Ligand binder design. Structure first.
Ligand SMILES: [Mn+2]
Ligand SMILES: [Mn+2]
Ligand SMILES: [Zn+2]
Length: 370
């Protein structure tokens, strides 16, 4: 990172997609000029309440501070850079995108490999992306969703529909609550199954065998499978345990657990039986967890797309929804890598940053069309 200033200089000068960025945040009078940005400099010193007249101004400033990070905040009632002139109470956050922040640490207790990321546990992010995006688009009817790699151990989602940008904390909160399933045992399903639950479960089943029974190997052995047993009622404990001892592999174990869980009787006074426990286990293991604060708060700062991670060097890139399954956090272009690519290409539009910029542009055309 000692060479980060030099690299960031070249990057902010030649690679950062200023026209696309400004198309985004400019989309309403003063909407770009009332946006807060916060830059972070050396030593974790950051300034809040920056705002800019236009694209050119933004470019000059970024090229002059060459910030380590950039956060985007809310659209305010006045230019944030003038907020000190504004009378008491008058300066107020007015609008902002609905944002989600999936972070891999949220699931430490369900990974056997990392505490950090790797191939074996990124699938968690794949599932969180498909689940959340499907609910936002199909259930809420939100049309403009930008998914972004955080540069390290997770993803961000920017919901940018005009009506959404206007939503209040109470509504943002209710959306998060609509989306949340995992709160000891963290998942408890109602008897009557809502379509959100069904469709998320389906998504999870696309991956569950390979992620959980083979990558993570959750029923590999005693200390493993006892964790699963904790999530199920105690009357079926020993039958399951002995079944798991006769069994050799995680797939056998899981199959038995399904058969047995579908035979558990929820009320003595009712002959109804189903996949609830199985589903509760799958969800507790694979469903996204959602911080109410990040999404609820309207003035909340969030890492900017096309930021550079000050530790990894990786660019916060847009994720192509069409290829969720193939996104690879380990082959994300670093600032080092793309700057080096400049020597061989001798053209700035032709580094490994290009396709990500295309994902961005695409999302922009959908905003436009709207
Ligand atoms: Mn976070
Ligand atoms: Mn994060
Ligand atoms: Zn891992």
């Amino acid at each position: 990172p000692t060479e980060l200033p030099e690299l960031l200089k070249l990057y902010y000068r030649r690679l950062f997609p200023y026209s696309q960025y400004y198309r985004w945040l400019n989309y309403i009078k003063n909407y770009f000029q009332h946006r807060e940005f916060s830059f972070t400099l050396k030593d974790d010193i950051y300034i809040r309440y920056q705002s800019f007249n236009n694209q050119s101004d933004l470019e000059k400033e970024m090229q002059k501070m060459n910030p380590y990070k950039i956060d985007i905040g809310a659209v305010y009632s006045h230019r944030p850079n003038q907020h000190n002139t504004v009378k008491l109470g008058a300066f107020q956050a007015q609008e902002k995108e609905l944002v989600f922040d999936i972070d891999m640490t949220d699931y430490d207790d369900v990974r056997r490999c990392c505490s950090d990321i790797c191939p074996k546990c990124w699938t968690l992010m794949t599932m969180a992306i498909r689940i959340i995006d499907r609910a936002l688009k199909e259930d809420f009817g939100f049309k403009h969703r930008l998914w972004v790699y955080s540069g390290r151990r997770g993803v961000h989602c920017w919901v940018c529909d005009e009506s959404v940008r206007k939503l209040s904390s109470a509504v943002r909160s209710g959306i998060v609550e609509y989306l949340s399933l995992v709160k000891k045992k963290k998942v408890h399903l109602s008897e009557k199954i809502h379509p959100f639950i069904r469709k998320s479960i389906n998504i999870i089943k696309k991956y569950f065998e390979e992620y959980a029974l083979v990558n993570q190997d959750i029923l590999e052995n005693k200390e493993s499978w006892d964790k699963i047993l904790a999530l199920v009622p105690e009357t079926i404990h020993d039958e399951l345990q002995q079944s798991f001892q006769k069994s050799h592999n995680s797939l056998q174990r899981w199959e038995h657990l399904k058969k047995v869980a579908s035979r558990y009787q929820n009320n003595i006074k009712n002959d109804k039986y189903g996949p609830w426990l199985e589903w509760e286990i799958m969800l507790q293991y694979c469903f996204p967890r959602l911080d109410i604060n990040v999404s609820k708060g309207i003035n909340h700062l969030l890492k900017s797309p096309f930021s550079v991670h000050p530790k990894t060097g990786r660019i916060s890139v847009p994720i192509d929804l069409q290829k969720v399954d193939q996104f690879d956090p380990f082959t994300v272009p670093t600032i080092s890598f793309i700057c080096r690519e400049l020597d061989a290409t001798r053209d700035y539009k032709k580094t490994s940053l290009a396709p990500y910029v295309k994902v961005f542009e695409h999302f922009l055309e959908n905003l436009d069309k709207s």
